[PDB]
Enzyme design. Sequence first.
Site, PDB file in Angstrom:
ATOM      1  N   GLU A  42       0.821  -1.218   0.000  1.00  0.00           N
ATOM      2  CA  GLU A  42       0.000   0.000   0.000  1.00  0.00           C
ATOM      3  C   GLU A  42       0.856   1.270   0.000  1.00  0.00           C
ATOM      4  OE1 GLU A  42      -3.091  -0.211   3.078  1.00  0.00           O
ATOM      5  OE2 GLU A  42      -4.313  -1.243   1.578  1.00  0.00           O
ATOM      6  N   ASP A  43       1.884   1.296   0.850  1.00  0.00           N
ATOM      7  CA  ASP A  43       2.779   2.452   0.971  1.00  0.00           C
ATOM      8  C   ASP A  43       3.760   2.557  -0.204  1.00  0.00           C
ATOM      9  OD1 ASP A  43       1.604   3.135   3.491  1.00  0.00           O
ATOM     10  OD2 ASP A  43       2.972   1.767   4.521  1.00  0.00           O
TER      11      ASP A  43
END
Lengths: 321, 323
Positions: free
Chosen positions: A63-64
Amino acid sequence: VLEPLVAVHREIYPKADLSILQRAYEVADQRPYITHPLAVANILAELGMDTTTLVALLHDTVEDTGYTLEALTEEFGEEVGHLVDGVTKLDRVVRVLVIKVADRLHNMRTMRFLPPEKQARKARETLEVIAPLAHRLGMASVKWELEDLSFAILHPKKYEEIVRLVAGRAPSRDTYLAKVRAEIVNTLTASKIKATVEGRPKHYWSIYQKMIVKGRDFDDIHDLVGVRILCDEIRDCYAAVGVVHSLWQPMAGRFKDYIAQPRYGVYQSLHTTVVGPEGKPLEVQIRTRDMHRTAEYGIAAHWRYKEAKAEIDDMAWMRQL
Amino acid sequence: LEPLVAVHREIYPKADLSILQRAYEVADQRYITHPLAVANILAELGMDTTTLVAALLHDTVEDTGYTLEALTEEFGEEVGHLVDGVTKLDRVVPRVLVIKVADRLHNMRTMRFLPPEKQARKARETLEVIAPLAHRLGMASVKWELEDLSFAILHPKKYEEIVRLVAGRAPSRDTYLAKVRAEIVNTLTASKIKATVEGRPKHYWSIYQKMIVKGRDFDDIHDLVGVRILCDEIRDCYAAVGVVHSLWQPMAGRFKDYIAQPRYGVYQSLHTTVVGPEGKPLEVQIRTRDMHRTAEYGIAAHWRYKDDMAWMRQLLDWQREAA
Ligand SMILES: [Mg+2]
Ligand SMILES: [Mg+2]
């Protein structure tokens, strides 16, 4: 930092292929701080989950960062692939199951920033669907803490009321226990039973509901007086009930033997209440070290699941939906 | 005879066996079973070989022309003091004391001489002084017996009524105990505690007094359903109290811990009563094999609390007898 968390793992099991968990952190480090994965990985290691779970340090990366699961799975394996995805798929609800409870436990403990929506609602959400879920996983230390924190934020003055109400009679109540502890330990040392005799670690959300059902003007002096005994083997747990009863008269209909009869699987605990040194109902909770290991921190949750109001993941989704 | 030695020897490997061979031989030359038969029940308790020798030649002097001066020279002063000391103890309406109780216990066991006045009187005497004297030392197995025989003779139709009443509800009452023994043994085998689970041996003199103080109308079904758990070590005795409570609910009062607090001399034992298995109370009495040995065959009590020690205690004993 990296050494202690890996050390907290190694003592449990002399395991092979250490070069995966070095790879796990290294790749994660390169991929305010990056400590959440390792901080989680430590409290999972404290529970004592698989070295694959420890590796699966790399859960918040997709996600990051820019890189994706297809790249991740190739480096480590298919198992890490399913885990990181499975844990990522779990979202807010009005191996994969245990990893999440850790992630959240830390986040609840560390709330440096208090931006609005996440703060009040995370507490609300934890209590609603994470505390019971944690309880289903049979880890009392995870749940109990998760609640107290959550309870403080949701109902601040009610928390204040309790902790203040707790603090008032503390000196008189703490002395009363210190006598019991002495009185109980003396006779078992004469009896030659190896046993630890700790005081019960107390919880405010419990006190809150316990008060709520009883109503205002409930008894404060004896409700907070709980004690535990710990023993090496089942024999000695039953021996403790011996010495307790020798010192004080027991109360009828409030006696249990979960070692004798397991509910929700293996609780493996004996619960008894006796009329006390100043006529106080005192809740004793005898159980072994091995049974303690189960009761507070580590379980796999194989059977006797019950709905209310891996296979577990589809089960969990059904539970929230 | 040969078997007397076997029961004695396995207690303690001991030297100078010749003395007990000399003891019986010289006694045999001097119905001659009473000395050796006594010498056996003392050996069962586990007394000193000197005591075994003495108890083998104690009654000789009264029945035999040979005297103590000759007797002591053959076996020394100790046997001199013992054999004399016991003879001095006569009929009233610590090694010396134990020999006397064994004698009376045997003579009570075998009573083909009903004609003599003793049949009732000797029984009266035992119940009045010898039952308390046996009990005071700490010996119950001796006491238990002494009473039932004496009480049966003294009150024949009362005894009959107690054994009759006992016999009536026996099949219903023994079935509970069989279920209780099973339920107890299942759970302690799961708990992995080594424990024997015998039924309590009943006594009719006890039932007589119990029903006297409690009156005629009394619950025979639960009066004596008593269990007796037995374990090797103190730890395990407390573990038994655990399994019992797990199965059934314990009464608030009537609980004791004699291991923790021994009344007078050491009578270490855990007494607990529990209700609701059959809706009736049941008396459990946990204690160690060592503890059990101790209780059943207490060699002696340092003092009852109520040589010179023997004479004065004898003096109080004899006053209790006069009573
Ligand atoms: Mg996170
Ligand atoms: Mg004689």
